[PDB]
Amino acid sequence: SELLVNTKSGKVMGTRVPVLSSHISAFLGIPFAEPPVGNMRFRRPEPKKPWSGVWNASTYPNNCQQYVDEQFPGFSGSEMWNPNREMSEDCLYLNIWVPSPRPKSTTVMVWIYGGGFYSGSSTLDVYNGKYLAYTEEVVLVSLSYRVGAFGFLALHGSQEAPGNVGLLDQRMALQWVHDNIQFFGGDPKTVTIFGESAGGASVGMHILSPGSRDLFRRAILQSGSPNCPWASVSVAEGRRRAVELGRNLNCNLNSDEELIHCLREKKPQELIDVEWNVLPFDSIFRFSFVPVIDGEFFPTSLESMLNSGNFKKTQILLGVNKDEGSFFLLYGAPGFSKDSESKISREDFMSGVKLSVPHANDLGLDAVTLQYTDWMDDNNGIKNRDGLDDIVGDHNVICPLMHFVNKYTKFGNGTYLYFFNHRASNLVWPEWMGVIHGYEIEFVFGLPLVKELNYTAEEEALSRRIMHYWATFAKTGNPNEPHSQESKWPLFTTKEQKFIDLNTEPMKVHQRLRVQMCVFWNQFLPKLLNAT
Amino acid sequence: SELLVNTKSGKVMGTRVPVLSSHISAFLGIPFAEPPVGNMRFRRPEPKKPWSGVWNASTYPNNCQQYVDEQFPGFSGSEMWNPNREMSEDCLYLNIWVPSPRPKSTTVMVWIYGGGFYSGSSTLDVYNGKYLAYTEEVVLVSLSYRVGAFGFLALHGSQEAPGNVGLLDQRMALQWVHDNIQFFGGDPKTVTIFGESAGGASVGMHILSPGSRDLFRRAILQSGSPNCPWASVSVAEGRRRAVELGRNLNCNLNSDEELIHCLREKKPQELIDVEWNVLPFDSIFRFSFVPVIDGEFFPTSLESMLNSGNFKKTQILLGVNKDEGSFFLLYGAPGFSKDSESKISREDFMSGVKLSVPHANDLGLDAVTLQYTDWMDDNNGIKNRDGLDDIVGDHNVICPLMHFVNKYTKFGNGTYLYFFNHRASNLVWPEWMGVIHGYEIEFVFGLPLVKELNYTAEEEALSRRIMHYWATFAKTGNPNEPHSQESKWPLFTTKEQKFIDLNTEPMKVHQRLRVQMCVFWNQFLPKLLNAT
Numbered sequence A, B: 001s002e003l004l005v006n007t008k009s010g011k012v013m014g015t016r017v018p019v020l021s022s023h024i025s026a027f028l029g030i031p032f033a034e035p036p037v038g039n040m041r042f043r044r045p046e047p048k049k050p051w052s053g054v055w056n057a058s059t060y061p062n063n064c065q066q067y068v069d070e071q072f073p074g075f076s077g078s079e080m081w082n083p084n085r086e087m088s089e090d091c092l093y094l095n096i097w098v099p100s101p102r103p104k105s106t107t108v109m110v111w112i113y114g115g116g117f118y119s120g121s122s123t124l125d126v127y128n129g130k131y132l133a134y135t136e137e138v139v140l141v142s143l144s145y146r147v148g149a150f151g152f153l154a155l156h157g158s159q160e161a162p163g164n165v166g167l168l169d170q171r172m173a174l175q176w177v178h179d180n181i182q183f184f185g186g187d188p189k190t191v192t193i194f195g196e197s198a199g200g201a202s203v204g205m206h207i208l209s210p211g212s213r214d215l216f217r218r219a220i221l222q223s224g225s226p227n228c229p230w231a232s233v234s235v236a237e238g239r240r241r242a243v244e245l246g247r248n249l250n251c252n253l254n255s256d257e258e259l260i261h262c263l264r265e266k267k268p269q270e271l272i273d274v275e276w277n278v279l280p281f282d283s284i285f286r287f288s289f290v291p292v293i294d295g296e297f298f299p300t301s302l303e304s305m306l307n308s309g310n311f312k313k314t315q316i317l318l319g320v321n322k323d324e325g326s327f328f329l330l331y332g333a334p335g336f337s338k339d340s341e342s343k344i345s346r347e348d349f350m351s352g353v354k355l356s357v358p359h360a361n362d363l364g365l366d367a368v369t370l371q372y373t374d375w376m377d378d379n380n381g382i383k384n385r386d387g388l389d390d391i392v393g394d395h396n397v398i399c400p401l402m403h404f405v406n407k408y409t410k411f412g413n414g415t416y417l418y419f420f421n422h423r424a425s426n427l428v429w430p431e432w433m434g435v436i437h438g439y440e441i442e443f444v445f446g447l448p449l450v451k452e453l454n455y456t457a458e459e460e461a462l463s464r465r466i467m468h469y470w471a472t473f474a475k476t477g478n479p480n481e482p483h484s485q486e487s488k489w490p491l492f493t494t495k496e497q498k499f500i501d502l503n504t505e506p507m508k509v510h511q512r513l514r515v516q517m518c519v520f521w522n523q524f525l526p527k528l529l530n531a532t
């Protein structure tokens, strides 16, 4: 009865799940779209046709077809991110965690996983929503969307492979929530979408896209924003990459109709196996198939829409991690290792910045190098290692997000900015990697509340402060409970630009997060590249 | 007898001078050239034709025709630099202080005054050589040369105004020393030339010029070097400024000879009054009539000569002051005042950068601005003032000199590098201007040994260290006395790049003098301006 819910698409049967020392309801693997299989590959998704009977929704759905990281087999630090379920092109499902007993009209949060737009799963351990739903009395939804070529191949002009269909996948899940969340105790007029990395940029892209704005109330962006350099491409580049994807598979390249037909004949892993051969340069933090600026989902360039205020006016809560770049240097840069301190030589450093700013000309490379090199101590392996990390994280995450937050605040209705700089007491990665890309998700999702996971007492407390900020923001548009005796997270304004740290210590308020480096990244370096 | 000396050109009668609690010999205003007057204006100097009888040499000579600074009339701090004798085109004289009794063969130091190549006199109080001749038992010479258009108007191709005749004035005095200093007790085989500002660049230019290399032994350069941006021009820009000086005074511009004839009819102050009107930009630390890269004095470009090693190989001692730029901001930049602390607004800062890097495009100015702005505190008037100060000093003196120091040390036979950062306890200029362009000369010349000048006991000891450094270096090529247990001024090498502070505290050895900012000024900015 509590577990049996009738939706506009059909009946669904959930399952009772234990959560700490209590229980809540879970609805797992609910379909929201028609499977994008066969001739529906590279397609705009179509709504799930209603079903008769009762949908068994007690088990996680499949994961979408994606690259699988096999660098450290058996290593929990890397495999906690890989698909923990069978992969399939039939993957467009969503999951819901409802408090027990079921609320009447409670706040809804909708998780959007990240992963460079080429990977990601709704079913990972760190995305399990029971702790959040149960602790903050919210209805927690995690959606899914097609990644890699399956969701972002873009042959603009074709209605058959138009691009951005993975973004339409998320839009349609949010439409489902809009149409059905009431039957689970959720209030569709108070829906918060939130995501990390490509999920965070996705969230920002729904803030921008007119066809998405009315499908949610407010937004949380973690280590990602729509203007990121890795987050979108022109139709010309997206076309070039799709045409090049065919050339790698001996496809006929004369018509989109022929190219699309050829690529529809390929097994999923055939596309995945050559997915990276299509990038223009040797690079890190760069991905082949990503959203496109198409004049449709995005009416104009991301920057003109930001200048004109052409976007959803609401409240946003967003932030970054202290060492966003370390994960990428480990995997793609010379001199970095999981098992050493990864002191970086001068020769390696130069190769690093080349691989980090792959679009820059020789003058631009000098500019980056000069801004991050202490020429009293240029052979210092550690300053060179830490410099390269800052290069990667500033260029790709921090400074793109800061440009977004300053532009948005000029028109929005409330900004809250955080800096997550706590290193987990139980990290499995070496100490040089710092506060890693994606390792705040464990605290947002309350995993430190599980005593067997061996977080410290202070980390359980930090994870509860964070969950409550997120939830209170989702409920009210403000992370702070007014009238409460707690330290207050201040609003980010255009003039004072305040933000807080997130960590185990009492709160500190700072101003102008990485202003110096981000003036370089957001104003000087593009002006130098435009000229030259 | 001690004061009567026979030279290859005629007899000279000196005078017996008091110094501290003793006396020495002084020969003032000895002619070394024919008066470059009338039809000889702008021409190469001619050797002074011998005279019969006894030249009265007990009186300072005339000063050369030059701009006279009247900003602060009566103020000792600016008027100590103005001509203290009558001005005249008949100004090619030299002065000699000789210890008493006369030594047999003793080291010779030849002083070359600075002043932007448009001003400067051999006869100023701070250049009075008795203290240095007496305290260090050297024969001390101060020469003179033509400045302004009189010394450096350049119409390459013409033999009537070929350019660089001011440098040639210096060369001829050096030739006279080589020919006569032995009669005053000086060893012509151990002559050290030294000068500040334009005088330091001049010393450097004699190191480069083949026709000068044999006329001296070793060199000291203070707050100036031949590759400074204000220190030379092309033949085209010299001709351009010459033609414009003509246009400014309604001269026939048809031919070099008509133009030269017209200018030779003008009174001296007629030329001076329009001297500034020929500069290409609104600028500070830029001077109209300066040496020319002509192909004869300088065989090729200064950089090629520095690269090929085409220069005199010997020992050099050289350095800079802490705040070279404040004097020029006082006189030519908005917001600076003699009587206030001159906190600089952001608008005046921007106006400063433009006047300071007049040859930069907009990308260059943003580069300078970014490099010297603290964007956590951009409305700090002190930080803005001190930034503008560093921009002027680094771009015009410190970084130009460090490039010379590095290039020269690769081929030279001994470099010694100093950083003079003591601020005199009796300065008449405000604290914000720091250690000023020019104000190390007083310590080099031992003015702190005069009790009436109200220096501190520790400044007299500093001045004595400096005099002994200079004289010892001149005597031996090493500022350090052997087998003394005083701290040793380390040789500057290609790889360790050590230098010393000069102040009242015990000496410390540092490395890489302002290497961060000078990578920008010597390697990045020129590359950016060449690319844009």
Ligand SMILES: COc1cc(CNC(=O)Cc2ccc(CNc3c4c(nc5cc(Cl)ccc35)C[C@H]3CC(C)=C[C@@H]4C3)cc2)ccc1O
Pocket: B067, B068, B069, B077, B078, B081, B082, B114, B115, B116, B119, B197, B198, B282, B283, B284, B327, B330, B331, B332, B333, B429, B436, B437, B438
């Ligand atoms: C656009 O900017 C402007 C720039 C100027 C330039 N100002 C001048 O030429 C005036 C001037 C000022 C001073 C001198 C000679 N005096 C000095 C000299 C030196 N340092 C000084 C430091 C101070 Cl604080 C004051 C005077 C010094 C150090 C030596 C180098 C020079 C160039 C001149 C001598 C000797 C000559 C000429 C005038 C008006 C402007 O608007």
